[PDB]
Structure 1
């Protein structure tokens, strides 16, 4: 093969330019043996490896085999015309969010979350705010630059806003789970009305949460976004910091 590099035909690299040496490793659910090796080589041949050779194969169980394969890929990628997808946005890491807060904001992001009304459901907001988080996604209070305050299950809206004012909360988290007779939307509207009457609807992000609430519903009720059952703590932290830097809102520490 020609060893000159062509940027319209970028190909993997082994020890010589313009070859295709690539490495694979996968487990097939078949008993080990010659037939398993042939199956692995045929499978890797469909992926585009020209001369797939099973470097290694060993039985993980009576019906599982682990393979390592090397081959010269035939496919090529047009690097010169490749365009970067700027739309790729993802939740920041823990330390990434910490340094983001430290850079773009002097203060610690004060977050006050609480289930309000008569709901006893708190495993969601605890999944968001507790140190161990949820499925390895540590909660907001684990973050160095966040002062998370969790007020519990049955917190009346008056107590919630009072605690937010007392602590100087930059953002407020409300969790609603029981949707019987649409009691959740009623309580959320009451919360927004109380905040607006207090004159401090601004100055604070007002995020919503729950299993049967969606961004459309939150925006309908006047909340700054709302997170459904699939949310983790890093999602909430990324939103709470990004939307706070975008809209430069002052925490309630400046409210007397």
Structure 2
């Protein structure tokens, strides 16, 4: 695959790190340049990294459930930072509790996320979606 740069982090007050490690491993092996800002990252850290590294996509991981709060407004800030049209992915365990997935996906897409991933999403799904979206299959 042709090289592209993504930003990868865990948003908000969320300290889960194992998935962040696997995702970095997986997206690196797939040929991506992963700018991994790590856990406990506010929205600004994603945007600052996206700017400095000219990222093609921001992968927001959110495991602890409060991402439904933390994730609101990221797109607007990306627009205001001059990152219009940047890819925004969100996955992990992004709402509190088991919920009806079509409702969750619409909730986060309406926040401005391009793709929304359910619990237990294999990184390979994200990699394939990103290749498609960046048209580098």
- Please say whether Structure 1 and Structure 2 have the same fold, judged by a TM-score greater than 0.5: yes
Where relative contact order (Cα < 8 A, 6+ residues apart) is larger, the structure is 2
SS of match in other structure, 2:34: strand
Q: Which residue of 2 aligns with 1:154?
A: 40
Cα distance in structure 2, aligned partners of 1:215 and 1:127: 23
Greater fraction helix: 2
- 1:208 aligned to 78, 81, 90, which one? 90
Give the superposition deviation at 1:186: 2.2
- 1:192 aligned to 75, 91, 108, which one? 75
Cα distance in structure 2, aligned partners of 1:166 and 1:212: 27
Contact 1:112–1:171 at 8 Å: present in 2 too?
Answer: yes
Q: Which residue of 2 aligns with 1:230?
A: 120
5 Å matches for 1:44-83?
A: none
Cα distance in structure 1, aligned partners of 2:73 and 2:94: 18
Contact 2:7–2:34 at 8 Å: present in 1 too?
Answer: yes
Contact 2:7–2:57 at 8 Å: present in 1 too?
Answer: yes
Say if 1:156 and 1:209 are closer, same or farther in 2 by CA, change over 3 A. Answer: same
RMSD across aligned positions (CA): 1.9
Listed as ranges, the gaps of 5+ residues in structure 2 are 96-103
Cα distance in structure 2, aligned partners of 1:217 and 1:201: 20
Contact 1:112–1:172 at 8 Å: present in 2 too?
Answer: yes
Cα distance in structure 2, aligned partners of 1:197 and 1:129: 27
SS of match in other structure, 1:150: strand
Q: When the two structures are aligned, how many residues end up with a matched partner?
A: 128
Q: What per-residue deviation string (whole Å, max 9, x for no partner) do you get for residues 193-246 of structure 1? A: 2112223131x2110012245533331221011112231121111100101229
Contact 1:210–1:229 at 8 Å: present in 2 too?
Answer: yes
- 2:11 aligned to 99, 109, 116, which one? 116
Q: What per-residue deviation string (whole Å, max 9, x for no partner) do you get for residues 26-50 of structure 1? A: xxxxxxxxxxxxxxxxxxxxxxxxx
Q: What per-residue deviation string (whole Å, max 9, x for no partner) do you get for residues 44-92 of structure 1? A: xxxxxxxxxxxxxxxxxxxxxxxxxxxxxxxxxxxxxxxxxxxxxxxxx
5 Å matches for 1:5-154?
A: 98=1, 102=2, 108-130=3-25, 139-143=26-30, 145-154=31-40
Give the superposition deviation at 1:120: 0.6
